[PDB]
Ligand binder design. Structure first.
Ligand SMILES: CO[C@H]1/C=C/O[C@@]2(C)Oc3c(C)c(O)c4c(O)c(c(/C=N/N5CCN(C)CC5)c(O)c4c3C2=O)NC(=O)/C(C)=C\C=C\[C@H](C)[C@H](O)[C@@H](C)[C@@H](O)[C@@H](C)[C@H](OC(C)=O)[C@@H]1C
Lengths: 1114, 95, 225, 31, 105, 249, 158
């Protein structure tokens, strides 16, 4: 189908590469392909240079130095797939080349040393960690610098916050107390500030000079003439107070740290630490908070002018102002590369500690490198991160958009940066300053609302990790071709113009110009303007940006629609929507879920499993197509070819489609004809009515793959064995297993059916005599082996797509101790719609299928076609998701006019334009009618008449023109399939894009009556033959109490859970047909009495008149 | 069309839950003695409808409720001793 | 296809009002039968009702006859509630004469006791007159089809006679419903319950049987020329 | 809420708690 | 803002008494006046995320779609309300639980 | 404060945010100095009370106003603790209810007063001792545990003392813990102590309430499980004339 | 899912799930009603992969007759988060809930699920019908006002 574009404002720049944050960071923290001479700090190089000139105990005295020279990343031992198949971290050996030096000089430049294994990234953006794809999600935290803030605990006061780059120094707080005292806080220890100043040579006078003026605040700094005396004697008493136990004069040892040297405090090299404090504090700075080693003393750098600024802020200079701990000029992103390198830094600082211990031990003339290095610290520290840190997610794989979204995810919680899910409110709020940097829609609904967030579309993270947006420059009048990505900080300085603003050619078009400056909306002179917006897209996330008529959607329902799309399960007949925002080409492409040509050539080999192409010279590549794989989420992602054997190629046009892709256009669901009316309570509340005609067309039907696993271990009683000779079993049972004990490819597998056969030994006593006499005499000889196979969980199953086996010792395979051999079986299902499936559109209209109607019913147009979904209107005006309506109307045009559309966000279709398209479309739909020899049947009229009385049609006009009007208005006369009559009053009808979601009734829903009760708790759970019981929570108990439901409650606590005696009395009773039990004494009572006795404490029962009663006697 | 005349039932008792406790105990005795207990027997007995039709309604609870609103039954807070009310019940074909 | 041919119960009153249930039925044919029937039921079952009234001394649709407590309309409406059936099977129309004495209650039976015409509902209130009661009547009764009101036809007989609404349709109300009965594994097979309401003239079972014959009769026409 | 006098046995204490507490679902947390 | 509303509802009443939106919101079906007036009239004055009221009102009305800035300014409020629910919801029945404990007997 | 925070604030019965001042005694008003520090006097012949107000105080009484004991003077919340001891437990009760409904009402909810009434009754359920009868004079005891030891040690076996008490404003959660019932007191955080204290003393339960009975899985003492109903038996007419034929042999 | 065809006092209940739910109940019924001689041979003849006889669904219905299920949804915020219903054998895999009952339950047909419980003692069963039956619980216990009342869509028509 053909394509119709909409709206003005052309984009000066295309969208950034999208997976930027992820891909382009690691690369530059990894400096993989750059001569080891040029490699220039931050990343792996940093962590190395950070730690490395490693002097020995007694520095430069006992010999032995050891220093960094260069590092080499290896070649990964296994293929990208080999790793996933054999559960491996896709890694590479990082050796580092180091030279050891003596006091008598050694040039022992040991030929590299293994330092540990380093995981590395896909082309995609993701990692592989023991099989399974993973995402390192990027975190936000306060940016290093000096800050202030008002005292929340102390009304009308101010604390002073000193923040270095994380895991490189501690939090320092100055806070003038309601008791004169000033106190420096640090390491969660609090000491009088003076001490630290006394160390920096601050006399009781130079304080009265630089820090009196504003108020008598120095009063509590001064009355401590107790220690304003000797610098060295200060150093000791501080050392004493801070980290106690050991009080001599070598305090300089500790005090050197949070002073000079990039040991801890390197708030910045050439970054914000200075810059920020050089702009927010009192100018002039170098690198670390206070410079230590000058000529033995400790010279000040930051501490005083902070204490100054704080003081000049409780009365203070106008222009001295509190800090916005929320401004995106103080919120940075930590990209993957940064977090990995930060963990790489932990490794070294652990290896160093180890190296330091060993140089001392060994004889100084024997020790080389390789002989000093641990290779287990780094290996472990890098291992721990990628596997175990909260910032290391699984991978949202449901559809190709999901994965993409998952990369540009910004978190607030997790490690280091530690916001607990039990904090913040303004930390949740959308800040003016998110504009263009973070989406003001597209957050999660409950609990996380505000703390998890997505990256704005055109936005990008910069060198020091602040998000920047693009703004066009305006040379007073003209709108330049030059764009500038700028800080949220470097932004509060200009009169920025909206992109809405019109332009005759390349210059402004009206004297009243809409614009924001420092946030608040302002109307401004065409000269006043300093920058422009590039596109409205700029403002929102990708998923937001996927919503056709966002204009007319209320923000709240728009978030639901912005999500959910993530939840869209790829369909067999995926199809891109009839109405788009354009963005759908690129989201597929950047996801790399789809294949594309390399260098314009010609295709040669085109079949199900391969596309190979003769390129322009370039040699020859075959590209394999992943086929019916399985997502992280059971999604089943697969590629389909879209090119002809022999044709010239598009320098990089679609070679093969993805999973949610139709012709390289994001296809997350289907477009379908909808009626907007109530049915018969069948679309009540939010329910939806389906035309079974959908199922027939294999429309909303999706493929899902599940995977099953089973292990084999050795134990005291013998080895568990993956046999095919399972005891006590028919040949009917084994019918489908190869000579091995594993199911065949392509087996229809039912619930209960054997998936993988395997036999534990188990020695439950030794068969008593007598019962061996019979066992021998009658033949059936005793056995040493149990059934313990796999078998299909109740309700699961489908057709057996793939098997897979890793036994102990296999090439690169290592599996957990005391286990040998792992079997995995993959089963596939084809789904179709069902009563209880969830369908939603991009405007946030969710709802479940409640009724599939046979074609006989279903509202149908006069020409004969019935509609496909009946969507209740009452779910419209409550929420204000008005776009969904707008989108249906165009979809009616499109249906007859036979086209697709592209109406981008805040710059798409305008009513008149749709109406014109509708007018054009009706001349056809009725053009047909009258051409095939028909028109306005008695039913249509009946309606039209009462329709003008409603006031939708023009009285005076002819029934034909009356029909046109009504049509054009997006409405039309509809017929009840059930009774040949019409519904009086026209119905709005059209084509609508809807998606089928993650959740299906298939995966929900169980019924239990009796089954495996646990040997631990003794209540129902575990389901070896059937599923497991529903739980009765505290709130359900209150309700039963609130009713008069005595027994019904008691039942739920005794004969239905752990009350074995009566539990069984129940079952027996019904089998017989007896009125259940009457559990006289509840077990849980007896169990109470006793657990108490086993502690002493008499605990004794008494009846009415008050004589011991006894509840036991068993 | 909810329950067989349920409003008329509440009226008989002093407290809601009495009706509940009686309807239970009557169904309880009704259940044990294979329905040979009825006070409504004749053509008043409650019935079902099938692929055949008109088979006795199995639910003992139902029976108690219809049996109760014929007045015939007598419930009480304390008249007749239980230890002698259990044995005397086996009079016309017991369990 | 499976299953079997259905059962037709008919719990009946005895003149007006009948219930009818065609039970187990393929998923849909509840409406596929009940709907067309309903239509025909209220629309083609031939009947007989009042059509034109002349009353002595003054005319118009709105008036008050002195000596008569009611007013022309309440007479005219009462009239409409009068049921009567035609014996002589080729009768097309009749006229009814009413002679009203002194102080009295005038029933429908106080009409002319002419045969060829049995008055179905003779205990009708017609009208009441006080002392010195003069009311003479001449009302045309007519064979017709549906509901054909006074505005369309304009039945002339005299010049002081006023035409009435013609409710010739012995069914005065029809309503049906289609729930769904279990049948073994199948829980969703249709169960159609038709409920008819008539006057005196024609019984409901009759109405339905007529109605089924009519649609059966029309379906026939669909035969190649 | 049979719009009668109460029957003895109604565990009102709890009916009270729910009754009071459920509409706290629509009670603003922003203070 | 108040007059647009009270005269969107004047219109409906006087011509179009059977309008879906109207009829729904006049009966107890769904909808309400503020909702309606956000669809047909004007969304009105908006609060910044810090209490203060944005002195440029959202002049537009869903039907005639609102715009980028109009959209953005009217987003701060959407969140410091959608969090209000989620913070009330997460606390299971904290208050009912307190209550059930003092009273159950 | 408003919304759900306020509902807690009332039930938990705490010194509220904005502790609006209330006159300890009745007399006349005498506001003085609107500049340096602001203060409202309540005075008669005899007593003369001085209340010093924050300045930011939104007091709504103009000078020389007449006034009632315990009546608000500064506007905002009343500390229902200050109210109790200065106007009564009954008077406190009626305040609480009236004030909670206030929130529920103004947000839009309708629910019976008698509901809130029941809970507020428990918030008062307790009393502290003055001059004891057979215990120590510091104990916190249930109001109608010390009712049998009040007008019964005077109804028959008179002597010793009727036991003098004072009302106490327990805050719903704190009125929760202090229950006669070790069983339910246990479920709560500190379980050792309950079981310690309780075992040392004879401590019988009685299983009055619900939670208790549930803990042991016993049959709830309400509804079908209320002594008032549970004992009801049912007998047939033919069966009743099987007792006329068997009770006189 | 919504259940508009059912009476106020009726229930959703996928036959498959109603079958498992009452299984023991159905086992003796299968004995008493002829066909299947052993209670164990009955369990065999339902289990045996699948495909249940017409004669069994016929029976399931005769067990179910007059008994109720407790439905229950979400945060059970008042007694009314638990109601009692006479269950109705249904096509498909979704419990279908009456549109009136939504008010109290605060269910919405946009993804919500409900859980179902079967009481066993004639006591529990009585207890459930008489006191907790949806159709016996018409007015709110908070304020005598109607809780099961015409709503959203029912009002539209009227
Ligand atoms: C170590 O990873 C965990 C961290 C725990 O620690 C902890 C404290 O820190 C967290 C961080 C740092 C997050 O960034 C995060 C998150 O973004 C998120 C949810 C909760 N999301 N859900 C909302 C609704 N729902 C019905 C299900 C899940 C989270 O809880 C967390 C989270 C935590 O809880 N999600 C969202 O809001 C959005 C926008 C999308 C989610 C998409 C899919 C569903 C997930 O990404 C899948 C692919 C997995 O990645 C997760 C399941 C991870 O589980 C593992 C081990 O794979 C989990 C993040």
């Amino acid at each position: 189908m053909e394509i119709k574009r909409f709206g003005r404002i052309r984009e000066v720049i295309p969208l950034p590469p999208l997976t930027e944050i992820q891909v382009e960071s690691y690369k530059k923290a990894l400096q993989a392909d750059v001569p080891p001479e040029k490699r220039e700090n931050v990343g792996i190089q940093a962590a190395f240079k950070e730690t490395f000139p490693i002097e020995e105990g007694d520095k430069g005295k006992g010999g032995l130095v050891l220093d960094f020279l260069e590092y080499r990343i290896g070649d990964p031992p296994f293929s990208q797939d080999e790793c996933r198949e054999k559960d491996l971290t896709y890694q590479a050996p990082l050796y580092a080349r180091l030279q050891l030096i003596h006091k008598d000089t050694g040039l022992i430049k040991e030929d590299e040393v293994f330092l540990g294994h380093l995981p590395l990234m896909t082309e995609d953006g993701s990692f592989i960690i023991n099989g399974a794809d993973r995402v390192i999600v990027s975190q936000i935290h306060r940016s290093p610098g000096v800050y202030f803030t008002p005292d929340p605990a102390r009304p009308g006061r101010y604390i002073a916050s000193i923040i270095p780059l994380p895991k490189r120094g501690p939090w320092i707080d100055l806070e003038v107390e309601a008791s004169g005292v000033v106190t420096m806080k640090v390491n969660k220890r609090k000491f009088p500030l003076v001490l630290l100043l006394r160390v920096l040579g601050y006399d009781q006078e130079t304080l009265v000079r630089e820090l009196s003026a504003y108020g008598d605040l120095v009063q509590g700094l001064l009355d401590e003439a107790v220690l304003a005396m000797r610098p060295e004697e200060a150093m000791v008493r501080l050392f004493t107070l801070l980290r106690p136990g050991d009080p001599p004069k070598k305090d300089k040892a500790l005090a050197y740290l949070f002073g000079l040297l990039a040991d801890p405090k390197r708030y910045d090299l050439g970054e914000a630490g200075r810059y920020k404090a050089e702009e927010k504090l009192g100018v002039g700075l170098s690198g670390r908070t206070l410079v230590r080693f000058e000529d033995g003393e400790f010279k000040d750098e930051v501490f005083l002018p902070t204490l100054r600024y704080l003081f000049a802020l409780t009365a203070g200079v106008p222009g001295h102002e509190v800090d916005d701990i929320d401004h995106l000029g103080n919120r940075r992103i930590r990209t993957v590369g940064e977090l990995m390198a930060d963990q790489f830094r932990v490794g070294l600082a652990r290896l160093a500690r180890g190296v330091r211990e060993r140089m001392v031990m060994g004889s100084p003339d024997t020790l080389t490198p390789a002989k000093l290095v641990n290779s287990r610290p780094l290996e472990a520290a890098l291992r721990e991160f990628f596997s175990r840190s909260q910032l290391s997610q699984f991978k949202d794989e449901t559809n190709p958009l999901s994965s993409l979204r998952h990369k540009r995810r910004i978190s607030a919680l997790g490690p280091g940066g530690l916001t607990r899910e039990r904090a913040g409110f303004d930390v949740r709020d959308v800040h003016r300053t998110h504009y263009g940097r973070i989406c003001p829609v597209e957050t999660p609904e409950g609990a996380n609302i505000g703390l998890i967030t997505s990256l704005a579309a055109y936005a990008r993270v910069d060198a020091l990790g602040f998000i920047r947006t693009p703004y066009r420059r305006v040379k007073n009048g003209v709108v330049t071709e030059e764009v500038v990505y700028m800080t949220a900080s470097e932004e509060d300085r200009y009169t920025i113009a909206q992109a809405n603003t019109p332009l005759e050619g390349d210059r402004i078009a009206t004297d009243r110009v809409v614009a924001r400056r420092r946030g608040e909306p302002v109307i401004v002179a065409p000269e006043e303007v300093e920058f422009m917006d590039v596109s409205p897209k700029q403002v929102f996330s990708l998923n937001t940006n996927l919503i056709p008529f966002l204009e007319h959607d209320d923000a709240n329902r728009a978030l639901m629609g912005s999500n959910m799309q993530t939840q869209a399960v790829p369909l067999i007949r995926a199809q891109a929507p009839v109405v788009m925002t354009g963005l759908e080409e690129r989201v597929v492409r950047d996801s790399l879920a789809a294949l594309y040509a390399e260098e314009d050539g010609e295709v040669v080999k085109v079949d199900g499993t391969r596309i190979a192409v003769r390129y322009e010279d370039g040699r020859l590549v075959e590209h394999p197509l992943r086929r019916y794989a399985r997502s992280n989420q059971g999604t089943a992602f697969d590629q389909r070819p879209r090119v002809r054997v022999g044709q010239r190629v598009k320098k990089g046009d679609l070679l093969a489609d993805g999973p949610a892709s139709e012709e390289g256009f994001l296809a997350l669901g289907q477009n379908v004809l909808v009626a907007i009316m109530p049915f018969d309570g069948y679309n009540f509340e939010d329910a939806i009515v389906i035309s079974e005609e959908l199922l027939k067309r294999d429309f909303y039907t999706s493929i899902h793959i599940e995977r099953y696993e089973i292990e084999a271990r050795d134990t005291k009683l013998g080895p568990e064995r993956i046999t095919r000779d399972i005891p006590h079993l028919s040949e009917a049972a084994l019918r489908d297993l190869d000579e091995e004990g594993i199911v065949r490819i392509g087996a229809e597998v039912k619930p209960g059916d054997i998936l993988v056969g395997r036999t534990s030994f188990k020695g439950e006593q030794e068969p008593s005599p007598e019962e061996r006499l019979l066992r021998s005499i009658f033949g059936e000889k005793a056995r040493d082996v149990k059934d313990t196979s796999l078998r299909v969980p109740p309700g699961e199953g489908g057709i057996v797509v793939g098997r897979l086996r890793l036994r102990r010792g296999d090439p690169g395979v290592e599996l957990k101790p005391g286990v040998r051999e792992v079997v995995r079986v993959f089963v596939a299902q084809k789904r179709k719609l069902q009563v209880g499936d969830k369908l939603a559109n991009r405007h946030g209209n969710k709802g479940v299928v409640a009724k599939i109607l046979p074609v006989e019913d279903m509202p149908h147009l006069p020409d004969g076609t019935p509609v496909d979904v009946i969507l209740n209107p009452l779910g419209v005006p409550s929420r204000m998701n008005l776009g969904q309506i707008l989108e249906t109307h165009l979809g009616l045009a499109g249906y007859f006019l036979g086209q697709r559309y592209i109406s981008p966000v805040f710059d798409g279709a305008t009513e008149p334009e749709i109406k014109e398209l509708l007018a054009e479309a009706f001349n056809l739909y009725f053009g047909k009618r009258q051409g095939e020899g028909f028109g306005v049947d008695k039913r249509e009229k009946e309606v039209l008449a009462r329709a003008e009385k409603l006031g939708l049609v023009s009285p005076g006009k002819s029934p034909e023109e009356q029909l046109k009007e009504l049509f054009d208005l997006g409405k039309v006369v509809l017929y009840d399939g059930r009774t040949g009559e019409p519904f009086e009053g026209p119905i709005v009808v059209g084509q609508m894009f809807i998606m089928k979601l993650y959740h299906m009734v298939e995966d929900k829903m169980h019924a239990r009556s009796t089954g495996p009760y646990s040997l631990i708790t003794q209540q129902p759970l575990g389901g070896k033959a059937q599923f497991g019981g529903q739980r009765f929570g505290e709130m359900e108990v209150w309700a039963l109490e609130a009713y008069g439901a005595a027994h019904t409650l008691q039942e739920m606590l005794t004969i239905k859970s752990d009350d074995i005696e009566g539990r069984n009395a129940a079952y027996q009773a019904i089998i017989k047909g007896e009125d259940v039990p009457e559990p006289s004494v509840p077990e849980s009572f007896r169990v109470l009495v006793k657990e108490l006795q086993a502690l002493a404490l008499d605990v004794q029962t008494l009846d009415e008149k008050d004589n011991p009663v006894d509840i036991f006697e068993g | 069309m909810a329950e067989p005349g349920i409003d008329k039932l509440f009226g008989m008792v002093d407290s809601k839950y009495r009706l509940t406790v009686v309807v239970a105990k009557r169904a309880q005795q009704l259940l044990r003695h294979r329905f040979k207990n009825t006070v409504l027997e004749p053509e008043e007995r409650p019935k079902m409808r099938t692929l055949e039709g008109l088979y006795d309604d199995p639910n003992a609870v139902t029976w108690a409720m219809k049996e109760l609103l014929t007045g015939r039954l007598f419930f009480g807070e304390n008249l007749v001793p239980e230890d002698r009310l259990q044995k005397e019940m086996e009079r016309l074909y017991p369990t | 296809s499976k299953l079997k041919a259905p059962v037709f119960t008919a719990t009946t009153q005895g003149d007006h009002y009948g219930e009818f249930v065609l039970e187990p039925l393929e998923r849909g044919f509840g409406v596929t039968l009940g709907n067309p029937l309903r239509r025909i039921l209220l629309s083609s079952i031939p009947g007989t009702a009042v059509t034109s009234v002349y009353i002595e001394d003054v005319l118009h649709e709105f008036s008050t006859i002195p000596g008569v407590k009611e007013d022309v309309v309440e007479i005219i409406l009462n009239l409409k509630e009068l049921v009567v059936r035609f014996l002589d099977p080729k009768m097309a129309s009749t006229t009814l004469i009413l002679r009203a004495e002194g102080p009295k209650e005038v029933r429908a039976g106080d009409f002319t006791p002419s045969a060829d015409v049995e008055i179905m509902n003779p205990d009708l209130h017609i009208a009441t007159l006080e002392e010195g009661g003069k009311l003479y009547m001449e009302v045309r009764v007519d064979r017709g089809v549906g509901y054909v009101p006074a505005e369309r036809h304009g039945i002339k007989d005299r010049i002081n006679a006023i035409p009435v609404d013609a409710i010739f349709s012995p069914v005065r109300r029809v309503a049906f419903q289609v729930e769904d009965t279990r049948l073994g594994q199948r829980t969703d097979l249709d169960k159609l319950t038709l409920r008819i309401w008539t006057d005196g003239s024609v019984t409901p079972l009759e109405a339905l049987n007529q109605a089924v014959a009519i649609l059966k009769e029309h379906l026939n026409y669909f035969a190649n020329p | 809420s049979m719009a009668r006098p109460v029957s003895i046995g109604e565990a009102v204490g709890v009916v009270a708690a729910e009754s009071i507490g459920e509409p706290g679902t629509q009670l603003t947390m922003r203070t | 803002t108040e007059k647009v509303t009270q005269a969107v509802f004047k219109n409906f009443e006087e011509n179009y008494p059977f309008n879906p939106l109207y009829v729904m919101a006049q009966s107890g079906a769904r909808g309400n006046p503020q909702q309606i007036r956000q669809l047909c009239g004007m969304r009105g004055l908006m609060q910044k995320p810090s209490g203060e009221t944005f002195e440029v009102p959202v002049r537009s009305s869903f039907r005639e779609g609102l715009t980028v800035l109009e959209y953005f300014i009217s987003s701060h409020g959407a969140r410091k309300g959608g969090a209000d629910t989620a913070l009330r919801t997460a606390d299971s029945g904290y208050l009912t639980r307190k209550l059930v404990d003092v009273a159950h007997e | 404060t408003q919304g759900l925070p306020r509902v807690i604030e009332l039930f938990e019965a705490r010194r509220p945010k904005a502790k609006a001042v209330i006159s300890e005694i009745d007399g006349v008003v005498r506001i003085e100095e609107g500049e340096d520090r602001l203060s409202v006097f309540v005075e008669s012949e005899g007593f003369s009370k001085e209340y010093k107000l924050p300045k930011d105080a939104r007091l709504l009484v103009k000078d020389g106003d007449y006034v009632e004991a315990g009546q608000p003077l500064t506007r905002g919340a009343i500390d229902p603790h200050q109210l109790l001891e200065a106007k009564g437990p009954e008077a406190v009760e009626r305040y609480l209810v009236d004030e909670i409904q206030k929130v529920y009402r103004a947000q839009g909810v309708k629910l019976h007063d008698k509901h809130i009434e029941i809970v507020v009754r428990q918030m008062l359920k307790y009393v502290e001792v003055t001059d004891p009868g057979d215990s120590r004079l510091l104990e916190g005891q249930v109001l109608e545990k010390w009712d049998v030891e009040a007008l019964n040690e005077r109804l028959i076996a008179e002597g010793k003392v009727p036991v003098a008490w004072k009302p106490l404003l327990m805050g719903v959660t704190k009125s929760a813990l202090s229950t006669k019932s070790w069983l339910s007191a246990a479920s709560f955080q500190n379980t050792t102590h309950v079981l310690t204290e309780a075992a040392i003393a004879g401590k019988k339960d009685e299983l009055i309430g619900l939670k208790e009975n549930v803990i042991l899985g016993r049959l709830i003492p309400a509804g079908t499980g209320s002594d008032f109903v549970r004992f009801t038996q049912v007998v047939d007419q033919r069966t009743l004339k099987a007792i006329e034929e068997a009770r006189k042999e | 899912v919504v259940g508009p065809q059912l009476k106020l006092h009726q229930c959703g209940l996928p036959k498959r799930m109603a079958l498992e739910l009452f299984k023991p109940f159905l086992l003796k019924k299968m004995e008493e009603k002829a066909f299947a001689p052993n209670v164990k041979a009955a369990r065999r003849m339902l289990e045996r992969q699948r495909d249940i006889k017409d004669e069994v669904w016929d029976a399931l219905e005769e067990v179910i007759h007059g008994k109720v299920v407790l439905l229950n949804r979400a945060p059970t915020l008042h007694r009314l988060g638990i109601q009692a219903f006479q269950p109705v054998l249904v096509e498909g895999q979704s419990i279908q809930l009456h549109p009136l009952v939504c008010e109290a339950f605060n269910a919405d047909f946009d993804g919500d699920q409900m859980a179902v419980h079967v009481p066993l003692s004639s006591f529990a069963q009585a207890e459930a019908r008489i006191q907790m039956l949806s159709a016996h619980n018409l007015l709110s216990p908070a304020s005598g006002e109607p809780l099961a009342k015409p709503s959203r869509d029912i009002i539209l028509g009227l």
